[PDB]
Amino acid sequence: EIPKPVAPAPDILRCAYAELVVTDLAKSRNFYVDVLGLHVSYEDENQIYLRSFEEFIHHNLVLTKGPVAALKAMAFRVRTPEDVDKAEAYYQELGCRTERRKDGFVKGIGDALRVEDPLGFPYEFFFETTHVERLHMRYDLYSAGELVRLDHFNQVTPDVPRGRKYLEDLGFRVTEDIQDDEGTTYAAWMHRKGTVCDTALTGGNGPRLHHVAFSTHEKHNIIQICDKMGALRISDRIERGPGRHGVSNAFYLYILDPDNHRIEIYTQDYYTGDPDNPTITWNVHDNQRRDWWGNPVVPSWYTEASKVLDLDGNVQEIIERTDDSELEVTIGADGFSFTRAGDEDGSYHGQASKGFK
Amino acid sequence: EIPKPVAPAPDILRCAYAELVVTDLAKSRNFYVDVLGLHVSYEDENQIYLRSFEEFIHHNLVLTKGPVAALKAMAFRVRTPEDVDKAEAYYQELGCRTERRKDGFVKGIGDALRVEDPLGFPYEFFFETTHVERLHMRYDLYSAGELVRLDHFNQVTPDVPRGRKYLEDLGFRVTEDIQDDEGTTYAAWMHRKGTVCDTALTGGNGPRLHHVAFSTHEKHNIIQICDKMGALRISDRIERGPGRHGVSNAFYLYILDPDNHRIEIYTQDYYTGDPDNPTITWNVHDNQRRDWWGNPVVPSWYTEASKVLDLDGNVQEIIERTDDSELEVTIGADGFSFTRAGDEDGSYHGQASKGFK
Amino acid sequence: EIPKPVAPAPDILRCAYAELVVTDLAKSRNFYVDVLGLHVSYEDENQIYLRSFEEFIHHNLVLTKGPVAALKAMAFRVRTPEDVDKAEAYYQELGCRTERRKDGFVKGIGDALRVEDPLGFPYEFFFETTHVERLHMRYDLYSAGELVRLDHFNQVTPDVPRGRKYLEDLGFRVTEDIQDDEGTTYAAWMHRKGTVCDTALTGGNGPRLHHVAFSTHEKHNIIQICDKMGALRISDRIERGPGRHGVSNAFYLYILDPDNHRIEIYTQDYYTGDPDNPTITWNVHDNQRRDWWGNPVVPSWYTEASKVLDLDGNVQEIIERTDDSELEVTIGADGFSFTRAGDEDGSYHGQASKGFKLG
Amino acid sequence: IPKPVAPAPDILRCAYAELVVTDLAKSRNFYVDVLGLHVSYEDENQIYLRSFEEFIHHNLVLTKGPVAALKAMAFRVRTPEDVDKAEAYYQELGCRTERRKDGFVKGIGDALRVEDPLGFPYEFFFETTHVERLHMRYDLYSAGELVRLDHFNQVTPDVPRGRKYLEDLGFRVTEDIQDDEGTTYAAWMHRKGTVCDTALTGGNGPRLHHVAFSTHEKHNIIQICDKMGALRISDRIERGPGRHGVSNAFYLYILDPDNHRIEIYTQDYYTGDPDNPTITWNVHDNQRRDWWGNPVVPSWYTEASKVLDLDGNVQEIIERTDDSELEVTIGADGFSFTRAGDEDGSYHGQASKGFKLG
Numbered sequence A, B: 001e002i003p004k005p006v007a008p009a010p011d012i013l014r015c016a017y018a019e020l021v022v023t024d025l026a027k028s029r030n031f032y033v034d035v036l037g038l039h040v041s042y043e044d045e046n047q048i049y050l051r052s053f054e055e056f057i058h059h060n061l062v063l064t065k066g067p068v069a070a071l072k073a074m075a076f077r078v079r080t081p082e083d084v085d086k087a088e089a090y091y092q093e094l095g096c097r098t099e100r101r102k103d104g105f106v107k108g109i110g111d112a113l114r115v116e117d118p119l120g121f122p123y124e125f126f127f128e129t130t131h132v133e134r135l136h137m138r139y140d141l142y143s144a145g146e147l148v149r150l151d152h153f154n155q156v157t158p159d160v161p162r163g164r165k166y167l168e169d170l171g172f173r174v175t176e177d178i179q180d181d182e183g184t185t186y187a188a189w190m191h192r193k194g195t196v197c198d199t200a201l202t203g204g205n206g207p208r209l210h211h212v213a214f215s216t217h218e219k220h221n222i223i224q225i226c227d228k229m230g231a232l233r234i235s236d237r238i239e240r241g242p243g244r245h246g247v248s249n250a251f252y253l254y255i256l257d258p259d260n261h262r263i264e265i266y267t268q269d270y271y272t273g274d275p276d277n278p279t280i281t282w283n284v285h286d287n288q289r290r291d292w293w294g295n296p297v298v299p300s301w302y303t304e305a306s307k308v309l310d311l312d313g314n315v316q317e318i319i320e321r322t323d324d325s326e327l328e329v330t331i332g333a334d335g336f337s338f339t340r341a342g343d344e345d346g347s348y349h350g351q352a353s354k355g356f357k
Numbered sequence C: 001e002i003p004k005p006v007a008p009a010p011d012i013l014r015c016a017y018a019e020l021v022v023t024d025l026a027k028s029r030n031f032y033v034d035v036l037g038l039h040v041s042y043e044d045e046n047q048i049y050l051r052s053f054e055e056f057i058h059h060n061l062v063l064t065k066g067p068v069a070a071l072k073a074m075a076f077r078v079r080t081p082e083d084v085d086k087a088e089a090y091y092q093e094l095g096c097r098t099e100r101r102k103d104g105f106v107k108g109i110g111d112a113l114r115v116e117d118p119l120g121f122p123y124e125f126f127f128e129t130t131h132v133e134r135l136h137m138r139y140d141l142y143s144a145g146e147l148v149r150l151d152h153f154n155q156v157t158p159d160v161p162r163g164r165k166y167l168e169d170l171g172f173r174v175t176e177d178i179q180d181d182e183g184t185t186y187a188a189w190m191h192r193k194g195t196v197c198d199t200a201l202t203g204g205n206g207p208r209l210h211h212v213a214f215s216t217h218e219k220h221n222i223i224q225i226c227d228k229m230g231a232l233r234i235s236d237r238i239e240r241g242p243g244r245h246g247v248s249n250a251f252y253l254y255i256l257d258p259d260n261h262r263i264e265i266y267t268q269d270y271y272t273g274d275p276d277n278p279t280i281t282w283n284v285h286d287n288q289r290r291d292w293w294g295n296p297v298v299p300s301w302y303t304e305a306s307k308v309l310d311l312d313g314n315v316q317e318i319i320e321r322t323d324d325s326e327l328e329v330t331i332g333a334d335g336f337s338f339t340r341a342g343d344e345d346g347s348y349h350g351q352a353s354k355g356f357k358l359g
Numbered sequence D: 001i002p003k004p005v006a007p008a009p010d011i012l013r014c015a016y017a018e019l020v021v022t023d024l025a026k027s028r029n030f031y032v033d034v035l036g037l038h039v040s041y042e043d044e045n046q047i048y049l050r051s052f053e054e055f056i057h058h059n060l061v062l063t064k065g066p067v068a069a070l071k072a073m074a075f076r077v078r079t080p081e082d083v084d085k086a087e088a089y090y091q092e093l094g095c096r097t098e099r100r101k102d103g104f105v106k107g108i109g110d111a112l113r114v115e116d117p118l119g120f121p122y123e124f125f126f127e128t129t130h131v132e133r134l135h136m137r138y139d140l141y142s143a144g145e146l147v148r149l150d151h152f153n154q155v156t157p158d159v160p161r162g163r164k165y166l167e168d169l170g171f172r173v174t175e176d177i178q179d180d181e182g183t184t185y186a187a188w189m190h191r192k193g194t195v196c197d198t199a200l201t202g203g204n205g206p207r208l209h210h211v212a213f214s215t216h217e218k219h220n221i222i223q224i225c226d227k228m229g230a231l232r233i234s235d236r237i238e239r240g241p242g243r244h245g246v247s248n249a250f251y252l253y254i255l256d257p258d259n260h261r262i263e264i265y266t267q268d269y270y271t272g273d274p275d276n277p278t279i280t281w282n283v284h285d286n287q288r289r290d291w292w293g294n295p296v297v298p299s300w301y302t303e304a305s306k307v308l309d310l311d312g313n314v315q316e317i318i319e320r321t322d323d324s325e326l327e328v329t330i331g332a333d334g335f336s337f338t339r340a341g342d343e344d345g346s347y348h349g350q351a352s353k354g355f356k357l358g
């Protein structure tokens, strides 16, 4: 297990941006700008910097051209400039590789620390960022599918309890999780900013980035994204949804960018800011835990996720999960799920719900 | 081929109500009233008469207790009392069995003609009906899932072209249809009231009733029905959806009542009332034709449908479709669908879209 | 009273388009295209042809440059080419001036009849029109405020019963109206296509055009139009709303184009297509009849409306209403309105609701 | 008001209000039958109500009494120890305090009430009885469902004096309304990372302007209006619905049976970063309150609820001497603009959209 440092944890505000390596910058621009409507904060021949409708920091997404599509950094904003120093001491005590750039790794971020964290993920911590025009009332720019905030990340990692404890020490609080009666944990959601999560852990082979999630105002905004993808005849890039989540209670959609990076669109989870916020544990065999309406979870959702890079820009080696697989125990040949616990009517054995194998 | 009568067709206004035979009147009441929120016009120990939020005629749905769950009548309102005379002469010329009752078959309907039509379906034609309180501004009653109108019926019949010609002679105009490149028709939608349909034909073994559809005002009302069914832990009665249709462009959901009668919830199709309204023909292998977002159509949607009765109340014998099956050609072991015509990428061979078999 | 002709009425399908004369074509284009998002079917230096998201006929709105802003024609589509002949015979029997153009008055319309109707309004009847790409599934184009259909017209005329009878003979059925207990009709709504209206009559000096109405899919689309107008710092062009109507039960908004032509945005009225559809009569003093939430009706809504042209292109002379004024009897100095019939509590005497008086 | 040496309590959020109501049954009809709030406890004396997503015992306590008024506006603090900190903080300010180890109302434990420097009855507590969180109970969900308590708004005569005091208590200003000659008319300030938890409106005070509840979506607010029309109580819709300038939220103001003002609110923005950009509006900007330029009804500026001291007696009102927002915008000498510097779309001596004061 990952020891708790004696050094104080940095005070993390929220998830702030991701840097994604993409192979074809123009095709990625098409997707994030022309399809999804994100707002350009800066661009050149090598990178595109993008933000959501309500953001005032420089960006929520950096697309960087490179040879291998991968997550390069998932960045958290910290409360004060001194929290970057705290982050550096903390990860140094953990024995992690760190790199400090006083003028930042990407445009519009100042003093920043990147680390290869104990789960193999490239985290950035920063305070300083260039403020830009907050577009929250620019209804002359507002899209029918407008993405309004960056909401969270979701990470694939083999040992969820191990990661959970490490994130708890860093000040994240678990809001919801998925377990079975045998005591296996399959997934956990944890927050700093007072929503259901800022990052989440999904059990599986890792380190891999499962998705980045953006918010909309209303459910019809998410519908419109689907409708637009149909009109553009790219409905094959709709992976899963739209649906209502069990965990989080949010309305959701998962789509795939040109490099198969998964993006979640999300709205209307609940407030978690009180320190005794009640934690919700779902049973892995509950067929309403993921999609509340009982729609089946496509296998690619469980098996596919993005590579992540180390600080040299090389792909991180993957460690295979040895705990039980959520896919296998729910929709695989020996799996099952229920609608009502203890009722064989509305239960599914060795296949998924709604009549699919 | 069904001949065109010399006798003038009745002027049909719209689909008006269905009479469904149900086996447990209390369990059906719980579904239609407590779950779905339909409004009771009249009830006793044998029947429940239900209407939608904006209706002023007596009812849109009659639940009749009986031994075998089935459609007993699908009723269309005609423009004048004299149109019921026209209907009787028309169907008599077609050689169809008819029955006229000057004081109605069900409460709140006056002079009414029931027929066993050329496709084996029990049609009713009526003008006279008891007006009731139109609840369209009763927002003190309005449900988060409120059903606002009856929109259409959908019939399973083995020979779609044969049925289409008959309905056209009767004054219905085809709005959309599904065909392939080998001369087969799989489905057609046709209207009187200036929406995408009043009734529709689905290719399959029949006569059977595929579904009855009710409208909501907005898409979030359909999402609420799903959310409520999750909370009631009856998500296993959500068959398909929610989604955006290709055909009709409506937002939709299909659910199953306690006798497996299929109900569609529907909103926001388009105006068809101009006589040169452009017809839209989809290819049966186009994976956006049914669900615009490419979500797979569950096999039960193709295979399951309700019995229909003759005028003596006996189940109509089912005649097998010999034309190609939409299920088989799209999602069966030798099926095919595409996202983009001519593009191998995003096509599906011998399985359904989005990872499922 | 206007006689019922012996000649059969044309079979009218629906309101189809309006031709509005505008003074500055580029400013008008900015409003209808850049602000409101209507789709351009054709344009040149003299005219802009616009359609809604779900339309397949050539256009729903023609903007024509000219010296005096006005309604030039309100056009109804008829069921068959033969109905254009029927319309011509019908209006000739009424003694009205008519003009027939075999190849249309505006682009994308074929054989068309324009008439100076008995209320002084320029009506067009046509069947033939150039079909265009129906954009109803073009969600790549869909705006957060998208206008999806043309819904109706609303006309200001001094004598509502006179107009009502004439339109009923033409086959429109009244769906709702506003009357008082002393025999006065203040407004009526009437349809062909099975919505609350295709045209409507509002009591006042006329002929003038009160508004043209377009639909949206959902209420949030109307909210977005307001939000966008705020962002563009043209909220002064929001005249009234948004609200819920009593009459029609639709969610609504009224805005003003650059020549002060009034546009209604509208959604979620109810089905009226049955021939015995119940007619709803509201009392003029009911403060929920126009805005269901009781918000006050701005005086300009009652006083301001667009000029209309005759067939020569000259403005029609205005005839003064002599019947009682809706403005005066509800929000004027001797006006009255109620929230609950017979309850003094929530009534308004000599002023508007919600703490306001006439400016 | 000086900054104490004693540390401020760590305040999480607004948590509940206790309103005194004169007829408990009529108030129940409004809050439960009209608005759909959920009952956590009730008897002949009190009704305890919560929103759809709440897990603490209540967001609103309706207490029967002779004079309708705010009795307490309560904030939840982060730890039990923060209640001790609140007590020492307000004692150093010289304010009257009362501590009850077992609470003032049911479902709250150790609690401190104070008559604060602006005359308002604040409560601070940590301990509360958890209840069933109804957030997925879509079998109960109303077309107008109130999902959270969002904020309070207080009327006080000197906004800068109040603002400085709340800043010392850890609230951060998000937005405000000023004029060019240095008068402040209103300020909004937060702890939980929304546009506010409490807010100050310039006017005679102390009075409680409103309590605000959230919905999920804008159509839920529309439904509340529609329902009030159907119930033929549209006269209790005071103002709206609208889009706010300040906050950018969709809104509605309605009046309960004792004229307590309730706001329904949705879709403001995230303010939790410590350098969150502040926004200051000019008082003459006709889009600052209603973004669409709809007129602000005069009662919104003039009417607000009494507040009580710790003995249950009404607090004396102190008159505002700074300029009045009503007078400078919609009064006979008032003005507002749509575009700064433009006479077109400006209003002089009356409100927008063709109305003057009734």
Ligand SMILES: O=C(O)Cc1ccc(O)c(O)c1
Residues within 6 Å of the ligand: A154, A213, A245, A246, A247, A248, A264, A266, A289, A290, A291
């Ligand atoms: O539907 C699921 O898989 C559960 C779930 C809940 C919240 C999320 O953000 C997420 O990505 C996944």
Ligand SMILES: O=C(O)Cc1ccc(O)c(O)c1
Residues within 6 Å of the ligand: D153, D212, D244, D245, D246, D247, D263, D265, D288, D289, D290
């Ligand atoms: O419209 C207004 O008056 C400005 C405003 C903004 C946010 C609030 O919560 C509020 O109560 C008032």
Ligand SMILES: [Ca+2]
Residues within 6 Å of the ligand: C180, C181, C182
């Ligand atoms: Ca009278």
Ligand SMILES: [Cl-]
Residues within 6 Å of the ligand: B245, B289, B290, B291
């Ligand atoms: Cl379908």
Ligand SMILES: [Cl-]
Residues within 6 Å of the ligand: C245, C247, C289, C290, C291
């Ligand atoms: Cl009106």
Ligand SMILES: [Fe+2]
Residues within 6 Å of the ligand: A152, A153, A154, A211, A213, A264
């Ligand atoms: Fe997620």
Ligand SMILES: [Fe+2]
Residues within 6 Å of the ligand: B152, B153, B154, B211, B213, B264
């Ligand atoms: Fe259907």
Ligand SMILES: [Fe+2]
Residues within 6 Å of the ligand: C152, C153, C154, C200, C211, C213, C264
């Ligand atoms: Fe209108």
Ligand SMILES: [Fe+2]
Residues within 6 Å of the ligand: D151, D152, D153, D210, D212, D263
């Ligand atoms: Fe407020």
